[PDB]
Point group: D2
Chain length 499, copies 4
């Protein structure tokens, strides 16, 4: 069929029968930190709770953590726990009188020189980045205050100071943030504060990290060292925020466990129309790598204070799903907004609509056609299981995979049914929450044994699919698991009748 | 190749070598009515001037008409002129004010009507009867505004010459998420029909009074193009806006990015796989000419069509190059401004002769393509005429 | 890839690395009846011994039966035993002599019947009722001999376990050129049904009394295999012939060349594209196992099937490697000798246990493949059991 | 669709509606040299008359030529005229008593030494090939008398003499022919007799040559020189007769205008089962090169004296057509047989049946898929015209091509309708007779003018298709021709209604 052929046969009035495959990441804050409010989130469709370590102390976050664990255990939900780092920031200094008026056609001196720190004026002020004169060059741009103030660099005046053309009127106040479009920003992967944050996260047993401002594969390697041997199983989702991150996306994808497309930050740097396309490129490379991709910022922002978003906003969410994103993320809408439950429920309705309006077989065929023949046994088995789901119209795909690898591999092939992953580890259950289509179920091997014949895990997976309404008796399921000899990957498939 | 494989191989920082295929409708009002303001719009990327008959008098819009013709003649451009009806309100197809505005438009040589609040196929027939015999060559673009229009879309497409997706109107009745999917349905049914489709309302609204739009609005525009729309339309942004030229140039730049980001071969294959066998000679000749554009990597497709019909038919199949249409009618030049990929070029038969052996019209299409930097000597073009040719440009 | 691209890339002087998939039926008579002559046939490539009940008495054929079992036991081989009925002559399905010969065959443990002069589906039901309850597991291969059999082939295939294309009989009634095309139709309908098809009569007739056949006869044999036949059958060449061993070895060599010259993936795709969606679990598992053989380039497919059903079902899909079938029944070993690609291996459950976890039968299939030089440690195999596995041979 | 899907839907009782696309080459001789008998041949389905210059003088052949021209002109037929060369032969000498009995396990001495010419015996006899001891080596084989006598070379005795093992009983008589399997046979492309034959052929205006025993591309080049500037437009069809010809088939195809698969000769040299496959390989390489391929010898041999062939024979003809051959050839069946008209008519019935039982779209798709993209304009136009024929179900394809190149290019794409070729040259009409699907029609430009607008040739082509029953008014035809600027290839297509 094709996406076109799918479109002309949709009826937008028919009820949707699909089960929601995309996953919703929610940022926690004042509107949602309480145990009751977390319960609301989870009931409304939250699969991952994000802690924004730009704001708050460790105890603030500790309370998010403890409250999330009480609420989840009460509901019997597995909910991913994400730590989103502050990252290194480029800020200005102070200004006599707390701010300066700058007018287009003004020139201004920008100095990385510490002695102008707290005495900025309209003629000259401080900017924290020591490699200022090195990284930025006649003709390049410095953007300040969420990119509204645009400066074009005329010249280098001394090693400390650049002369700059003011592109637009702006009132600049103490400590605003700066961006350097198209530049190689010589800043560490992880700040000093980040290490300590990461160390907290490891101790508290987070599931994943959202690593800010990832620009090179080597920096992902730095995040990996900072988590250490103790955090070696924590996922690193690299946040792509600038041109350099988009340039190096291949090395960054290969080094990371997933990607976050941070559209707001990308937009300070890059024209809005190229951000739309960067989002597509990034999500698609992630789809082909079989690694989760999260779409973030500027989601349903207006629903932070209004009881409804604009249509342009709802279309931006849907098209994240149509581009292929595994996840969509809420920020202030859940953290400080007035409508945290409704935004999440609405986000989940948008996801359902997009999923139903997508021709899922076409994504399966696209991915499949990119495999080299001969395929490895592992790839052959997952792709063949997904095909089977299409051929017999099975209603769930059950994967026995302890680490979740094998659930991320089926999901990459995009079956049109839910994927159940039976795993011996709770951390896998929580880590699977960013992967499209997947519901993990925990197999307690301490209590029920090693299950060498896989029979208790196959029954558990089938039970999980019955409880969720995915299957009834007489429906088919496709099962993927290891034999009695292979370790590392399931090399074995069954097509079973639900009983 | 697939959209998926196209996306992974894109470089967003490479310069774009494509030539903009999507077309931009602009609403004319106080910001844009003067001769010099229309010149700027046309330079900025306007292909169609819309007159919103919900507001102003006949004499108001007469000024638009007269200034548009002055501005377009001066630049050498063929610009479609559209009359967008008030429609009825709180129903009949056309109100009494509508009958009068349509009679005026017929009298003033309009190209097309945007008919408000089309709910059924029979209603499109009433607009047609209202344009009558004298308005029989004016195009009707039915505006889809409510659930019933969405429901009756197959019959309304069959009866109309095109469709306008009025997102803001639909969103009063239908939840936002179903307007998003209704847009997809309407655009793709009109792609399969071979008929122009215009995306309207809520485009870059914020640029009415700000110098830059939000990314979400930029994404909504790119999405209209990805969905398959021929045209995007501007309302207040150009009618009342503070930055009319800038919002047009910007809407142009978005279209071009979306276009470069699209795997056009996928659209072509998908349209082609829907064709009944055996095809009519007409379908076969146009799909096969487009197929040849892909096979020999031609850099332009040239259609000789006096009515513009076979230009629309080639455009349906989505070649990944510009379509030049040599026509003996100015009115066809204006009417093709809503058709994706087409640059019309007028062949003056009075001046140059009847051209039975098509040779002069072929040389005109080729020089038109050279003039625009679409081709240079040694490139390939595919030519369709009343017949197909594959030629080297010299 | 296509048959066309396979042919241009073939090298006829390269050694063949394929393992012979097609199967050879031999008629037993005076040239071939002794224990030592049957040993030679079996070594030469016989998979099925045919007894032509048009001639000789019960006691004559009893000797064949007893000598075949002695010879096969000695070599360790499972050889199908077939009873080919006289049929009626100048009509009923089965004559009186037929009822008696069938009763004898049922009593002697035959594998399959070749039922002469099948004209309708109802006639196949009469042969079935004549084998009765005691002969309910004997296969009926309906011999197609006239225009009516050809006409009623869909119903006759549905009712039978297989078909025999009796070219010489068909050629009495139907022009030679329509027998050529009727052969194509019957073979391809049985390929699509998943049921064995035997090509018979006029195979290498001239080798009855000469040491070499003509090229035209060699071509007719290769053609049967290209058409899609599971099996080729020898009559007088082995029954009365001067060179029985040589005609078998030669028929084997022809099959192997035709096989090497066939693009097997094309047959697989063509069969697979006929499948209704949704498939049954059984169709899905076998096509998908064969698909995997092509995807990972496995060197053998192993089916655990006690009845041989899923071995026939995998064979339908035409993998380009050997199919090993581990079965708990000798009778299934004998019955699979008419099924393209299959080497059956007997799993002695009495000796080795019930094997619920399939492990011993899997190790048996793998060692069977090693023993025949189909695989070596490090190759891939695909295993189907009551479930699919892709395994490295160790 | 596929060939399989085509097969299961055939009814072999339905009348055939197709028009015969394959072409029948007939060898002329005593049964068929008369003007009346040529007329019978032509009426029965002959498209090419072959002269076998192994037998007969120039005047014998002159009479074939003059009689063929009278019969064809009387019928208004274009009939190809082929000269099939003798070629160099390897013969034995004489034997005392006119022949020797040789028994398996005998050894015998074979000598290329002239002085044993006329005095052969059971112990030693003469064989004409001076490079005997050089070309054939311990372990190689010499085959004699249409390959029934097999000798295995034990050793070289002197420069002149090989010692040989007799593989089988045989009675050997004066002058029998010898073959050297798997050998590089050091013999000229063209004998002395061949040159003179070729010279006759050029003078008499033959259409094509069947060149015997072509083993290398360089030898085709030698045939080309021997025809000369005067014969530069005569087609060379290379006869492939041994292993070396099959080894070098690529260079030979590229140098020749077509191929003849000479199955009988191949069979002396190569096991019968490998001949079947060589035939497939050769025909398919020819199909992809868009050059005619003729299948020859051992066709319906038994119908030389019997009023009907065996089924094995009829199947061998059909499968030449199914392999893709443009032509099938009769030899003694028409030259000396008792049933020359019936064999030809029957051969044409077999061709019809095979054509109808072939899925022609599958050959079109196979050929098409072997083109590199970007295609040249010429290839794009022919393949696109053939596609059009399939898409609109046109009933003829009309190609305006003076040299016939463009008719050979459509035919390669295998449309399921007849191809009409309008050409300004009678020699093209006669040369097109070996090309599948094609009926040429002569456009007399001397009389009707240059037809710069192509309109008289398009009408002529349509008239030709009406006269032959291919089209009626309201049917469609696809037309391929040049514009007012392109020379060398038609770059222009029309789809027209027949009126
Ligand atoms: O939604 S959209 O954005 O697309 C959109 C569509 C239509 C729109 N219509 N806008 C207008 C603007 C002016 C206008 N009439 N002005 C005048 C007037 O009314 C009178 S009167 O005495 O009271 O009659 C005397 C005047 C004397 C002079 S002057 O002496 O030369 O200075 C100049 C003008 C007027 C009219 S309308 O003709 O009344 O309809 C309509 C706007 C937006
Ligand atoms: O078409 S196919 O090529 O597949 C095909 C199918 C079946 C075919 N059947 N061939 C035969 C051969 C012999 C034969 N009976 N022989 C004997 C016999 O008859 C008598 S009796 O006194 O007259 O009864 C006494 C004998 C004493 C001795 S001895 O004392 O040990 O030397 C040995 C033999 C016989 C029979 S049958 O049993 O009569 O039917 C059938 C052949 C070909
Ligand atoms: K953060
Ligand atoms: K309006
Ligand atoms: K019989
Ligand atoms: K000859």
């Amino acid at each position: 069929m094709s996406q076109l052929a799918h479109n002309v046969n949709l009826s937008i009035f028919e009820p949707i029968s699909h089960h929601r495959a995309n996953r919703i990441v929610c940022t926690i804050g004042p509107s949602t930190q309480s145990v009751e409010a977390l319960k609301g989130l989870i009931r409304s469709g939250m699969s991952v709770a994000r802690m924004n370590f730009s704001h708050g102390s460790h105890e603030y976050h500790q309370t998010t953590i403890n409250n999330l664990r009480a609420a989840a255990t009460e509901l019997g939900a597995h909910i991913g726990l994400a730590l989103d780092t502050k990252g290194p920031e480029i800020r200005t200094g102070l200004f006599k009188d707390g701010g300066i008026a700058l007018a287009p056609g003004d020139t201004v001196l920008v100095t990385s020189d510490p002695a102008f720190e707290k005495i900025g004026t309209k003629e000259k002020f401080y900017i924290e980045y020591p490699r200022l004169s090195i990284t930025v060059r006649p003709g390049g741009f410095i953007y300040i205050d969420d990119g509204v103030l645009s400066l074009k660099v005329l010249s280098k005046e001394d090693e400390y100071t650049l002369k700059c053309y003011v592109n637009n009127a702006h009132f600049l106040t103490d400590r605003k943030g700066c961006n350097l479009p198209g530049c190689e920003v010589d800043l560490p992967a992880v700040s000093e504060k980040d290490r300590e944050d990461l160390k907290f996260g490891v101790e508290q047993g987070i599931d994943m990290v959202f690593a800010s401002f990832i620009r090179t594969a080597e920096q992902v390697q730095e995040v990996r060292e900072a988590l250490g041997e103790k955090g070696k199983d924590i996922l690193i989702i690299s946040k792509i925020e600038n041109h350099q991150g988009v340039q190096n996306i291949d090395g960054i994808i290969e080094a990371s466990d997933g990607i976050m497309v941070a559209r707001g930050d990308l937009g300070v740097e890059i024209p809005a129309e190229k951000v739309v396309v960067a989002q597509m490129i990034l999500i698609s490379k992630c789809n082909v790598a079989g690694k989760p991709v999260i779409c973030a910022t500027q989601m349903l922002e207006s629903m932070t204070t209004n009881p409804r978003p604009t249509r342009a906003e709802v279309s931006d969410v849907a098209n994240a799903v149509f581009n292929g994103a595994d996840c969509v993320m809420l920020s202030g809408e859940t953290a400080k907004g007035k409508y945290p439950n409704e935004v999440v429920q609405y986000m989940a309705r948008i996801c359902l609509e997009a999923q139903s309006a997508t021709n899922q077989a076409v994504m399966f065929n696209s991915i499949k056609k990119m495999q080299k023949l001969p395929m490895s046994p592992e790839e052959a088995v997952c792709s063949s299981a997904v095909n089977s789901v299409y051929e017999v119209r099975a209603k769930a795909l059950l994967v026995l995979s302890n680490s979740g690898r094998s659930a991320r591999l089926a999901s990459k092939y995009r079956p049109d049914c839910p994927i159940i992953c039976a795993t011996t580890r709770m951390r896998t259950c929580r880590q699977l929450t960013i992967t499209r289509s997947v519901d993990a179920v925990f197999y307690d091997a301490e209590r029920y044994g090693e299950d060498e014949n896989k029979e208790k895990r196959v029954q558990l997976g089938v039970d999980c699919a019955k409880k969720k309404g995915y299957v009834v008796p007489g429906d088919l399921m496709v099962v993927v698991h290891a034999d009695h000899k292979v370790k590392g990957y399931p090399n074995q498939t069954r097509i079973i009748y639900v009983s």
